[PDB]
Structures are given as C-alpha cells and as structure tokens.
Write a protein that binds this DNA or RNA. Structure first.
Ligand SMILES: [Zn+2]
Lengths: 48, 300, 151, 714
RNA sequence: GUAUGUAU
RNA sequence: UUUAUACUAACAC
C-alpha cells in the first residue's frame, strides 16, 4: 500500500495491483489458500 | 456594469462555491489552445487569460439545489437511510427523534452494543445541522451513556467526514468501552491523529473541545470546528472531545479505518474485523432486538 | 482466457508492425495488455516455438539438466531447444509422476472489424488532408468552368 | 559540528527559495521579505524551516492599526528584544547523546512504574506517563501506537526498508527509521511559535498580507480552502494548471512583494487603475485585473463622492452652506496621479475661521491657527505597498503639493482632501477643519467605509481570489433600544415551517409525515404577524425537503414584503438563526437598502404553536392562507409597547417552562377573561407584576433543570 | 475554431 | 416514432 498512497497519478499495473490488494483485504483465507498454492507449484515467473 | 447591479453579481457567486475566478482562469487555459507556460508569455497575454464572466448565468435555479442535480439526486435515490414519507431506511431503527434516530450498524460489528445516531435530513458534516436538530442528539447521548453507566462502562462516540464532495450522510457512532480503557483513549487518538496525516498542514493537529467546554460547555465543538471543509471528531462524556481536520484524504482512508484501527487496538480485536464491509439490507431481528428492550428503560 | 479470435489478429499484428512494438498491438486487442500480448507471444503463437510432438530419445537428456541445475528453468530452455519453459517444467512433471507409480460474441466481432481498418490504411493525417485539398480544388473548378460556359 | 555541511545548508536553502523567487518574476529580487517563506502555513506561508541565520531587517516589522480614535503605530524592533534572526532548526532537537542517556533512564523509569504497578496489583495510568512522552528512542508513545498487537508479529523490518530502495524508484529520506516502531523521533511544535514572534507576531506577518483588504473582523476564526484543478490538455497546459493554487499565494503576499525595495524595476502604472506594478510579475497582473474587472476604480471614486453629496445636502443648514455643487468629473481623473481637480465645491453664508490642517481621528486638534470662508472636497484612492500604508504622511504631502501649486485650478487656496486606501482599508484627511465638520466626516466616513456598495464589491472580489472564507452588528442590549425606533423592522422566525408527526406502519416501519407550519414574521412596532400556512402537498413527493423548506420560507417572506406597500416595507430584517442569511439574501437583493442581521439571542419563538386556537384552525385549514394576527390585543389603549415586548417575550419563554404547567396556571385565572376579538388576557398593572415573577421563577427553574446550574449573578 | 494557409 | 455514426463542442460536471 505504501507505494501508491503517496503518488497522485496511478498507472495500469498499479491500478491492477490495488484491486488485488483491495480484494485480499475483504477475504483473507481465500487469498491465503492462493498464496500457499503459488509457492508449492510455480517455478517460472513473468518478465521482470 | 453599474455598482448597484454589480453588488448583485457578487453575492450570487458567493453561494456557488464551485465557480469563481479560479474556474474562469483554468477554463481560459484549456480554451486558449496556444499556451506557453512562461513569464514572458503570461505578461504578453495578461488580459486575454482573465477575460470571461459572459457565459456565467442561471441565478436562483442553480443555488436552490446545489452540488448539481444529477449527482445529488443519484446519491439521494440510492442513499440507504434518509427517513421520509416516501422512503423507508434500510437500517432497522430503534427510537425515532423528530430529526434523528438510533439504528444498528453493519454486520462486521465493533462491539456487542455498538450503535449509531443518524440525522433524518441529508446533513453531511454534523456542523451543518440546525441547532434545533442538535438538541435531540444531546438527549440521546445522555440516555445512551446512562444505559452503559449501569453496566459500569462509559462510552466514546465519533464521526468521520474526510470528504463532503462525495456527499455522504454522517453517522455518529457509539462505542461501548470500559472506564479504565476509556481513560487511555485520550492518548491513543492523540497519537493517531498527529501521526496519520502529513504534518506540514496549516490547521494544526488536535483541537481540544475538552478545554473549550470549560469556556463554553453547551457548544465548544460547534464554535471551534468549521463545517465547510473535511474533518473528524471524537468525544468523551457529553461535551468533551479531541478534534482533527483531514487533508489528503487519500492518505487518511476512504473506507474508514484511522479511527477503526485505533479501536481495533485499544479494544484489541482480530485483524479481520479491522475493515468494515457488508450492508444494512433489512429485517435483521435477532441482534437488534436485544438492544431495543435494554435501551427502552433509559430512553425517552 | 485467450481465444482463437485474439491470436489470429495478433499474428497479423506482428506481421504488420514488428515484435519490438507491443503497446500498438495491445490497443487493437482492447482487453489485452502489452505485457500479456508480448508474453503470450514468446510462449505460444510464434513460428519458432515447437508446439507439436516430443521425441523420447531427445527427451531423456532434458530431464538430465534438472539434476544439474535444480530450478534455474530459463537457462535450461535454450539448451533443451523446445523452449516455452512452462512446458519444459510440465514435461518433467509428467515423468516424475510416472517413475513413482511403477455481448461477448458481439464485442469480438467489433474488434475484428476495427483491426481490418488498421491493417488496410497507412496514409496518416497529412495524406488524408492533402487529398481533400485536391478534391476541393478539382470540385471547385467544375463549378467554376460551368460558370464560364453559362456566361 | 562540520563547516562543509553548513555551507550547503545555506546555499541549498537559497536554491529552493530562488526556485519560487523565479516563478514570480525573472529580474531576480534584490532582497525579499522573509515572512513569505518562513511564516507558518496557517498565515499563508510556505512553512519552510531553515538552517543557518536569516537577518530579518528591522524595517520589515513595523505595522499599523486603526480604531475610530486614531491610527496607532507599532515597532517590534524599537523595543528592547533579542536580535531579530529567524530561529535555527538545531536548537529544537535533543542531540543524540542526551536522547541515548535519557532513553535507557526513561525505559528504566517505565520498568520501575510498570513493575511497581504489578506489585500494587493495579494497572498503569495515563497520569504517570505524561511525564515522559517525547523521550526514549523507542518513544513511549509507540507503546500506545494503534497497531501494537499486529506490529508485534512484524519483524526484521529495519532491513526491509533499507532494501526497499531496489524495489521502487522513490528516493526515501526516512529510510533508517520507521514511524510505527520508533515513533516520531522529532518534535517541532515550539519552533513554529518562536518563528512567529521573530517575524513580529501574527500582526507583523499579517501586515505583509492582504488580510486587511478583506476587512474581516479578526484572525481568530478564519479559513482556507483546498482545490484540485476533463478535457485533453497535453503538456504546456497541465503545467499552467498545476500552478493555479500557486497564483493565489502571489495575491496574499502582493503588498510586500510589489514594492521598490524588492524590485529595482520600472514602475509602470497598470491600466484602468491607480495601482503600480514594479516588476512584471504576470501572475499578479492577471489577478488584479480579474478583480478590477469592470471599471471598478472609477466606480469606487464616484460611489464615494456620490455618497458625500447625499450627506452634505441634509446637513447644509447647520454649516450655513449657500450652494452644494459637485463638479464635472473627467473620465480619467480617478486614476491620474500628478494632477487632481476637486470634485465637490462648497460656499459659506457667514464666515469660517479654521486652523492649519490637522488629522481627523486623532484626539486633540487645534481650531484657531488660520482664517477662511470656503472649502472643497477631493477624494484620492490609493493602493498601498507594505513600504507605504501611512495615509497621514501621504495626504499631508498631497495638500502641501496641490495647495501651493500654481497649475492646479482649485477655486480657493483653502480646502480639504480625503485619502482612502483599498489594500489596508484605511482613511484620513489633512484639511481645513471646523467645529461640526470634524465629527461629521468622522462619523460619515466611518459609515461610508462600512456602508458603500463599491467597497463591499471590492472586498468580496478579493476574497474570491484568496478563497479566504470565515466562521451587521449582532443583537446586544444596546440594539433593543435601537429596534424600537421610528424605522419599521421585522423578526423573521423560520423555526416553524417543517415538522413531522409520528406514524407507525402496520408492519410497521417507523415513518414521518409533515404538519403545516407557520412562517413567523413578528413586527417590533405594530405588534402584528404575517403568518403563512403551508400545505402538506407541497412537501409531498419531494427530496431533500429540510433544505427545501428553508428556501420555501424565504421565497414567501420576500413575496410578503412585495405585497406590503412601499410605505410599510421594513428597514432592517432580523433572523433567529445564522443559517437563514444564505437563502434570504438572494431574494432581498432586489430590495438592497434593507440590512439583514444575524443574532446571538435565544428568542422564544418556540412557544407560539402552543396556543390552542392556532393548533385547531391550522389542522382544519385545507389551503394556503395569508392570515394576520395581533399579539397585543388592544393593549395599546392601556399598556405601552416597549414594556409589553419584554412581557410577551417573558410569557413566550414561560410556555417552555414547567413545560405545560405555566399555561395551566393561566387557566384557573378565570376572572381575568380574554377578549373575544383578541389573544392575550386582560391583566392589570398589579397582575402584570404578579405574572412577571411567577414566570421568571419558573423560567430559571427549567434553566436549573436543563442546564444544571441554579441561580447565579444578575 | 485559433495557431496556419486557399478564394473574392 | 425507433436504432447507429459523425458533425455540431467555439458545452457542463
Ligand atoms: Zn441519507
């Protein structure tokens, strides 16, 4: 959250993140479930 | 032209807060198309950038409604409370004053006997309320307090209106807290309010109505604080209180939290209760019924 | 999601512009973003990828590098040759399991017509405004010459 | 402790000023006023806190104040005070060693109290900790930090924030710490205070500004507003649009910025005005033009001269004036400077021995120093710098100039001139004075200054620029004697108009319905009423009806004044509540002479509906009716007005008093029968003095019941 | 709806 | 009378 509260303008990827951020706040156990799954399985990640 | 005619033009603007000499200046730049932002150019134009006040009109029809028609009506049509003949609120409601009422809050819930006072009219800032309407809120405050005095508790209430541009109702919420934890709260908030917002603000963090009430107990808040812009306010007893006006609301909290995070700490709850989500809907009897029977003994 | 309609414009897009540009393409795809539009290209759509078939004898050396590196999956891909590290991870996830056991229709049609306009014309603002000046001048004469015959 | 750092901290503080400095003007200020930068935000400042030392020059602390008894000058530097430098930052920061030593002391001191609390078996109190708030490197306030239960599980944070600089490209000065675990490690509170006093107090600062030009009562309770600022603008527009708020800042410090000592520039007069721009300062040139945006300068000159003619025609008999004639005004005379022909010429019937010119407001003035038989009046409007707001010295020069000058064609060599500043809203005159004139022009100008429409327009237009809002004289004991004058007045009481009875639904959800209410307009002379009864139907099928009803009342108050003839129309309308001024001034702008007041009184217009015939008839009333009542029966035959007003005000209070058992004392009073064509009973002079105390005793009972406190001083 | 050109 | 597109836009929030 820290990153984007300061900035007056927001960008596509930021817009995208804040939704996922706000969605997590609402229901944690569902987001927890997804985090654990992301660790176990995934080994290849998007372009940084 | 003409001075007696010109006085009339000035008072009309005074009511319309959205349009003044800043909008004619900002309009002229968008309209100018060719605009280099220098000091050489801004002088070479000079007169061309200020010139306007021809298209401005409307007179009474503009002011009577205020804050646009499409925007406020859309708010009013959806507004989940507002008590009229036509519309019945979504909140269950307990006791109705002439221009106010008590009702139960959303489902997350902060405490077992957590309530909220709500004015009937679309008031926003509780400073915009009539002095006639405010007197009913005071009788509610004392009876609610005396209800929790028999329980050995005491209460802290507050209201949070960081943005009146959104044009929302203001719900002054009652939070039952024990007296030893109550005595600490003066610290907690005083830290949270000074910390929360950036500290280059003009208004100065913290404005005590607790000291002002010794000077004028009937109205310290109403005298000191200002209605027009933002703001936030807590109080202890009938007419005590700590007060902070909010700027950079994006920093503050759009969903209500700066206060709720302080109660989430002071009272100490899980981190899932911190955020308030849900709805009023209707006909939620089993929780709101236990409050009504208890409240009726102390309630006028 | 990524349906067929998407990919067949994307293939036409890259032929148009070049694989360097990506936000020009993600405009014409509407709901896709130049990261996805590019990303999904290097995984799948392009010719260089080898989608079909997996030849056993060439494949027993692909699970061999996993013994060497362990994770490190993007350095494995240019060696193994099949690329699309996703599948290079999923293929070793096949063999390690076996060893142990023993409006929407309408909106798609809109973007498919908008894309046919983009590909078709390259003239730009100056071409369109310069030809209108010819068209006005030519049309102006035809009225002006009729005035001469009238007089 | 180093020199190398402290010769950046100077040069870099200057680099930042020089940014601002440039964005107002290109020619670069020789000096600049330091209030503008260092004055706190709440007085229109940037707030920027310095290292190094800024010699505040002495000439930039003088300031003036004007009562009706004179114009007091002040000097903050003349007095024996500490050398006037802006306070340093360092002197308000506990140097580490101290902090480190105190911290372990303090946290031991906490360990003492906290363990001795558990030895007592009684929890720790706020009273003890207020001793040590802003101390400890984990400051004890961090213990009362909200997120204390959740931050307990946060860990390894200090490293995170060091690394975060690789995560995102936002250079973060507070990296070494955090505010949530270490708390505020710095407190500036007492820096702000001591800066103000170095700048000359709130007055010393405010002088530099355009606070006076707005003419608000006092700084006490004033206000600032925050604006943002859609169409596709591109680059060069969005730059100009981000620098909208910036434009105001120039306005609010214009008086100290636009002067010869700040810009050694070419002083060109701005066109169609008497002002002078010294630099170019285009952000200021625009926003002054936007204020004087019709021909406002000429109109202020004429509006003053026109409202001197209307005072001098009424009082000509006392001065023994032969003829009062206003001269023909040249179109550009208003804003010329090197020449000024007189606007009002006068004559004398007898003779008039005057006196070497003196000043108006000042107390002791001499009356025998010269001899004349004639005078004139010439008003001079003048937009002041901070370097020159003394009108006394200004006018003084103008007389001594224009009096002995041969080129100026005044009739006599004996006359008067009135100086007026619009930036500080001041006035004076160094002219030939006489017994009668001195107290006249004293009173008349002090009225004109507060009265004129031209100067009221100016003051609103400035506030439009500044966006500086706030939170006629209010009703005191002296205003009771004034309201019973020959002038007709009204007391508009829009308490009544919206009320709801209680309806219970069959289910039934609680609901409200509205009962007709009276627009109560009470006369202070005739003692009559102009009640308007409003039907439920108007209320029906409406949204936001609380605010609607307040507009609906003011519409029909103005419609009632129209129906009333020009003879019987009021002079001063008074309202109970302060909120009523906004809707009411929109309808009463067509009748501009009426002065609309706000009050501080708790006027008893709550007890009016408690009369039984008012409940019965209005409940029955099935249409809107313009009804006329009398609240004095035919008392005028026996009882006088003034006393009867204090009586019925006492009696109206008295129906909120023992609630409904003061009226129940009037019911067994049968011998005193109420008249059939009238309202009140027929109480005699003894029975008035028996009614007074009964109600006054019970009134102060309800003040004892509601407001706790019983009887206090008178 | 001008910056900038075409026609009388 | 309904639907779409552009021009009206030198509009408004
Ligand atoms: Zn509402």
């Amino acid at each position: 959250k820290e990153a984007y509260s300061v900035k007056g303008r927001l960008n596509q990827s930021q817009r995208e993140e804040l939704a996922l951020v706000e969605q997590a706040y609402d229901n944690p156990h569902e987001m927890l479930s997804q985090i654990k799954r992301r660790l176990l399985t995934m080994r290849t990640f998007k372009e940084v | 032209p003409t001075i007696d005619e010109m006085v009339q033009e000035e008072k009309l603007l005074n009511k319309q807060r959205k349009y003044g000499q800043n909008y004619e200046y900002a309009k002229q730049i968008a309209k100018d198309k060719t605009y280099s932002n220098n000091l050489d150019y801004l002088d070479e134009n000079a007169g061309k950038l200020s010139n306007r006040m021809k298209r401005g009109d409307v007179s009474l029809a503009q002011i009577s409604s205020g804050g646009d028609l499409k925007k406020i009506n859309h708010v009013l049509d959806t507004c989940p409370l507002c008590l009229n003949y036509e519309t019945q609120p979504l909140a269950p409601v307990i006791s109705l004053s002439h221009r106010a009422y008590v009702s139960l809050p959303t489902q997350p819930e902060l405490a077992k006997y957590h309530c909220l006072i709500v004015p009937t009219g679309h008031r926003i800032n509780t400073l915009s309320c009539d002095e006639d309407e405010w007197d009913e809120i005071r009788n509610f405050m004392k009876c609610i307090a005396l209800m929790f005095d028999s329980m050995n508790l005491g209460v802290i209430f507050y209201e949070n209106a960081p943005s009146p541009q959104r044009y929302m109702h203001t719900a002054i919420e009652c939070i039952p807290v024990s007296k030893r934890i109550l005595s600490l709260a003066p610290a907690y908030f005083r830290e949270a309010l000074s910390t929360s917002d950036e500290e280059w603000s003009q208004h100065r963090k913290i404005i005590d109505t607790l000291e002002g009430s010794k000077k004028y107990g009937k109205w310290a808040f109403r005298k000191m604080m200002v209605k027009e812009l933002g703001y936030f306010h807590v109080w202890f007893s009938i007419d005590g209180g700590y007060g902070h006006v909010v700027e950079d609301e994006k920093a503050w909290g759009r969903h209500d939290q700066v206060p709720r995070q302080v109660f989430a700490s002071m009272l100490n709850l899980p981190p899932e209760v911190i955020r308030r989500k849900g709805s009023w809907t209707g006909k939620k009897d089993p929780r709101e019924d236990m409050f009504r029977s208890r409240f009726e003994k102390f309630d006028w | 999601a990524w349906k067929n309609t998407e990919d067949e414009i994307l293939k036409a897009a890259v032929s148009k512009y070049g694989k360097n540009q990506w936000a020009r393409i993600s405009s014409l795809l509407v709901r896709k973003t130049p990261k996805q539009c590019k990303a999904r290209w290097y995984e799948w759509i392009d010719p260089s990828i080898k989608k079909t078939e997996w030849s056993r004898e060439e494949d027993e050396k692909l699970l061999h590098l996993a013994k060497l590196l362990p994770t490190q999956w993007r350095t494995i891909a240019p060696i193994v040759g099949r690329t699309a590290t996703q599948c290079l991870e999923r293929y070793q996830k096949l063999l390690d399991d076996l060893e142990a056991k023993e409006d929407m229709d309408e909106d798609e049609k809109e973007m498919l017509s908008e894309a046919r306009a983009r590909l078709a014309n390259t003239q730009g603002k100056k071409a369109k405004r310069k030809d209108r000046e010819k068209q006005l001048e030519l049309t102006r004469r035809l009225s002006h010459l009729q005035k001469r015959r009238e007089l | 402790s180093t020199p190398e750092l402290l010769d950046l901290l100077v040069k870099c503080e200057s680099k930042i000023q020089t940014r601002v400095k440039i964005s107002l003007n290109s020619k670069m200020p020789s000096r600049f006023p330091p209030a503008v930068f260092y004055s706190p935000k709440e007085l229109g400042g940037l707030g920027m806190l310095s290292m190094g030392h800024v010699l505040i020059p002495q000439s930039d602390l003088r300031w003036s104040k004007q009562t009706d008894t004179g114009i007091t000058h002040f000097r903050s530097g003349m007095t024996t005070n500490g050398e006037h430098l802006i306070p340093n930052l360092y002197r308000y920061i506990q140097p580490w060693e101290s902090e480190f030593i105190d911290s372990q002391r303090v946290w031991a001191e906490y360990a003492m109290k906290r363990q001795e609390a558990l030895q007592q078996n009684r929890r720790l109190t706020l009273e003890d900790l207020e001793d040590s708030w802003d101390r400890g490197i984990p400051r004890i306030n961090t213990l009362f930090q909200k997120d204390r239960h959740t931050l307990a599980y946060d860990k390894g944070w200090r490293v995170r924030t060091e690394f975060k600089q690789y995560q995102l490209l936002k250079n973060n000065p507070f990296w070494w710490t955090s505010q949530r675990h270490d708390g505020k490690l710095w407190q500036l509170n007492n820096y702000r205070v001591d800066v103000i006093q170095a700048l000359g107090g709130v007055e010393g600062i405010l002088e530099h500004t355009m606070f006076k030009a707005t003419g608000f009562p006092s700084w006490e309770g004033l206000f600032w507003e925050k604006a943002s600022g859609f169409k596709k603008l591109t680059n060069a527009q969005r730059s100009g649009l981000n620098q909208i708020p910036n434009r105001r800042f120039t306005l609010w410090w214009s008086p100290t910025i636009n002067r010869a000592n700040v810009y050694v520039g070419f002083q060109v007069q701005l066109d169609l005005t008497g002002i002078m721009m010294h630099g170019k300062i285009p952000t200021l040139k625009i926003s002054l033009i936007q204020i004087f945006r019709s021909h406002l300068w000429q109109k202020i000159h004429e509006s003053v001269v026109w409202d001197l003619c209307q005072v001098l025609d009424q009082e000509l008999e006392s001065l023994q004036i032969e003829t009062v004639q206003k001269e023909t005004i040249h179109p550009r005379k208003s804003y010329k400077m090197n020449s000024s022909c007189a606007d009002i010429l006068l004559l004398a019937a007898y003779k008039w021995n005057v006196s070497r010119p003196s000043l108006l407001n000042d107390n002791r003035d001499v009356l025998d120093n010269t001899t004349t038989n004639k005078y004139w009046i010439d008003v001079q409007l003048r937009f002041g710098d901070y370097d020159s707001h003394d009108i006394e010295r200004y006018t003084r020069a103008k007389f001594l100039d224009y009096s002995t000058d041969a080129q100026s064609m005044y009739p006599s060599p004996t006359g008067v001139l009135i100086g007026i500043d619009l930036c500080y809203n001041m006035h004076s005159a160094y002219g030939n004075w006489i017994p009668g004139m001195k107290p006249l022009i004293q009173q008349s100008m002090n009225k004109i200054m507060k009265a004129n429409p031209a100067l009221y327009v100016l003051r609103e237009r400035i506030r439009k620029g500044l966006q500086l809002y706030a939170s006629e004289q209010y009703l005191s004991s002296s205003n009771y004697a004034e309201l019973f004058s020959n002038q007709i007045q009204l007391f508009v009481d829009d308490t009544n108009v919206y009320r709801v009875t209680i309806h219970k639904t069959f289910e039934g959800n609680l609901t409200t319905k509205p009962i007709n209410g009276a627009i109560f307009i009470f006369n202070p002379r005739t003692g009559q009423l102009f009640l308007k009864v409003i039907h439920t139907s108007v209320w029906a099928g409406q949204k936001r009806l609380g605010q609607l009803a307040k507009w609906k009342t003011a519409e029909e108050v103005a419609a009632l004044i129209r129906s009333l003839p020009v003879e019987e129309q009021p002079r001063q309308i008074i309202v109970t509540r302060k909120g009523m001024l906004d809707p009411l001034e929109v309808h009463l702008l067509d009748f501009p002479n009426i002065t609309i007041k706000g009050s501080e009184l708790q006027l008893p217009f709550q007890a009016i509906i408690k009369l039984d015939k008012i409940n019965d008839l209005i409940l029955r009333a099935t249409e809107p009716q313009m009804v006329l009542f009398n609240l004095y029966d035919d008392w005028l035959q026996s009882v006088s007005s003034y006393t009867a007003f204090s009586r019925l005000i006492l009696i109206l209070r008295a129906l909120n008093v023992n609630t409904e058992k003061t009226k129940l004392i009037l019911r067994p009073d049968k011998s005193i029968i109420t008249k059939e064509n009238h309202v009140w009973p027929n109480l005699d002079d003894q029975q008035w003095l028996d009614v007074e105390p009964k109600l006054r005793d019970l009134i102060l009972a309800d003040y004892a019941k509601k407001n706790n406190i019983n009887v206090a001083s008178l």
